[PDB]
Enzyme design. Structure first.
Site, PDB file in Angstrom:
ATOM      1  N   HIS A 120      32.047  54.367  36.039  1.00  0.00           N
ATOM      2  CA  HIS A 120      33.383  53.429  35.584  1.00  0.00           C
ATOM      3  C   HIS A 120      32.528  52.080  35.087  1.00  0.00           C
ATOM      4  O   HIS A 120      33.319  51.193  34.679  1.00  0.00           O
ATOM      5  CB  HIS A 120      34.018  52.885  37.179  1.00  0.00           C
ATOM      6  CG  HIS A 120      33.246  52.117  37.806  1.00  0.00           C
ATOM      7  ND1 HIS A 120      32.302  52.526  39.152  1.00  0.00           N
ATOM      8  CD2 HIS A 120      33.179  50.568  38.004  1.00  0.00           C
ATOM      9  CE1 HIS A 120      32.053  51.424  39.823  1.00  0.00           C
ATOM     10  NE2 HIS A 120      32.617  50.062  39.113  1.00  0.00           N
ATOM     11  N   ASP A 144      31.436  59.377  40.025  1.00  0.00           N
ATOM     12  CA  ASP A 144      31.143  58.376  39.374  1.00  0.00           C
ATOM     13  C   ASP A 144      29.505  58.085  39.095  1.00  0.00           C
ATOM     14  O   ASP A 144      29.089  57.189  39.762  1.00  0.00           O
ATOM     15  CB  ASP A 144      31.607  57.242  40.504  1.00  0.00           C
ATOM     16  CG  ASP A 144      31.729  55.863  39.912  1.00  0.00           C
ATOM     17  OD1 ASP A 144      31.720  55.864  38.545  1.00  0.00           O
ATOM     18  OD2 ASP A 144      31.883  54.670  40.426  1.00  0.00           O
ATOM     19  N   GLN A 178      31.563  42.509  43.219  1.00  0.00           N
ATOM     20  CA  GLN A 178      31.931  42.598  41.848  1.00  0.00           C
ATOM     21  C   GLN A 178      30.823  42.126  41.201  1.00  0.00           C
ATOM     22  O   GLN A 178      30.123  41.071  41.317  1.00  0.00           O
ATOM     23  CB  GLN A 178      33.273  41.609  41.514  1.00  0.00           C
ATOM     24  CG  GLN A 178      33.182  41.042  40.255  1.00  0.00           C
ATOM     25  CD  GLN A 178      33.016  42.086  39.041  1.00  0.00           C
ATOM     26  OE1 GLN A 178      33.707  42.909  38.886  1.00  0.00           O
ATOM     27  NE2 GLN A 178      32.190  41.781  37.945  1.00  0.00           N
ATOM     28  N   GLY A 179      30.318  42.900  40.259  1.00  0.00           N
ATOM     29  CA  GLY A 179      29.043  42.875  39.531  1.00  0.00           C
ATOM     30  C   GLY A 179      27.767  43.777  39.982  1.00  0.00           C
ATOM     31  O   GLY A 179      26.913  43.705  39.194  1.00  0.00           O
ATOM     32  N   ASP A 180      28.202  44.575  41.053  1.00  0.00           N
ATOM     33  CA  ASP A 180      26.883  45.026  41.540  1.00  0.00           C
ATOM     34  C   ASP A 180      27.156  46.684  41.200  1.00  0.00           C
ATOM     35  O   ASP A 180      26.268  47.531  41.513  1.00  0.00           O
ATOM     36  CB  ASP A 180      27.062  45.028  43.031  1.00  0.00           C
ATOM     37  CG  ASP A 180      26.461  43.862  43.618  1.00  0.00           C
ATOM     38  OD1 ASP A 180      25.462  43.139  42.983  1.00  0.00           O
ATOM     39  OD2 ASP A 180      27.020  43.218  44.962  1.00  0.00           O
ATOM     40  N   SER A 181      28.489  47.034  40.748  1.00  0.00           N
ATOM     41  CA  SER A 181      28.746  48.120  40.433  1.00  0.00           C
ATOM     42  C   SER A 181      27.759  48.931  39.617  1.00  0.00           C
ATOM     43  O   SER A 181      27.150  48.443  38.732  1.00  0.00           O
ATOM     44  CB  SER A 181      30.024  48.390  39.488  1.00  0.00           C
ATOM     45  OG  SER A 181      31.237  48.300  40.343  1.00  0.00           O
TER      46      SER A 181
END
Ligand SMILES: [Ca+2]
Length: 230
Positions: free
Chosen positions: A42, A89, A176-179
């Site tokens: 993603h 993913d 958010q931003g660790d994905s």
């Protein structure tokens, strides 16, 4: 990362910060090979030649003048991927030059899909928070697929997703931003091994809602096989 602390320089040297310039994405990843980054599907929009992604390695401090920033040449996104809640993913990013840091070995059996994991990233330390200058880390315990669903009512692709965190209390999670960053722990030889990729959840560190991670062991042979074409 919510509820974490600063990682020391050199502690998790396989970590990279990804910026997808084309779609404005900020993500993490791990050095699968010195010139191949394993991240989340993603985090990218598809497969093919792609020179729009930047990988920053070598440093916990993203503003450091020791940082190594290398550009992508090619992306391979899991075949059939559509959205992270439906599984698959994972993606590989081929870099133009190697980042000259240790790599992170990935789990190829379920032997390590339990215990206490470690996660790391430069994402927010609170829901709506901004991105971090310094790499943060935290420990999160394995949550069984069943324990994950019962509080969550998440629908899991059970063999493709591993849950981790503290559903009873909340307080610690990726955000958010660790994905795309790795979830990892020590193997039997006291070496780091990757069991997860930061994939999705519902807010960050909320009671009842563990983080959900790509279950790497399931995809390890497709990953290794795809990396060989790169
Ligand atoms: Ca699972």
């Amino acid at each position: 990362v919510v509820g974490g602390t600063r990682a020391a320089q050199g502690e998790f040297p396989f970590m990279v910060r990804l910026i997808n310039e084309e779609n404005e994405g900020f993500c993490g990843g791990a050095l699968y090979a010195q010139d191949i980054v394993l991240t989340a599907a993603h985090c990218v929009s598809g497969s093919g030649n792609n020179t729009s992604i930047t990988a920053t390695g070598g440093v916990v401090d993203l503003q450091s003048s020791s940082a190594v920033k290398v550009r992508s040449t090619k992306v391979l996104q899991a075949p059939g991927f559509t959205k992270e809640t439906y599984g698959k993913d994972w993606a590989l990013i081929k870099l133009a030059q190697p980042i000259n840091q240790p790599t992170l070995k990935i789990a190829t059996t379920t032997a390590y899909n339990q215990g206490t994991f470690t996660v790391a990233g430069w994402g927010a330390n609170r829901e709506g928070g901004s991105q971090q200058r310094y790499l943060l880390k935290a420990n999160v315990p394995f949550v069984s697929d069943a324990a994950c669903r019962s509080s969550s009512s998440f629908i899991l692709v059970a063999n493709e997703m591993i849950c981790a965190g503290y559903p009873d209390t909340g307080g610690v999670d990726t955000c958010q931003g660790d994905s795309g960053g790795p979830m990892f722990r020590k193997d039997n030889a006291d070496e780091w091994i990757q069991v997860g990729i930061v994939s999705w959840g519902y807010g960050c560190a909320r009671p009842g809602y563990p983080g959900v991670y790509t279950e790497v062991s399931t995809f390890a042979s497709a990953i290794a096989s795809a990396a060989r074409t790169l």
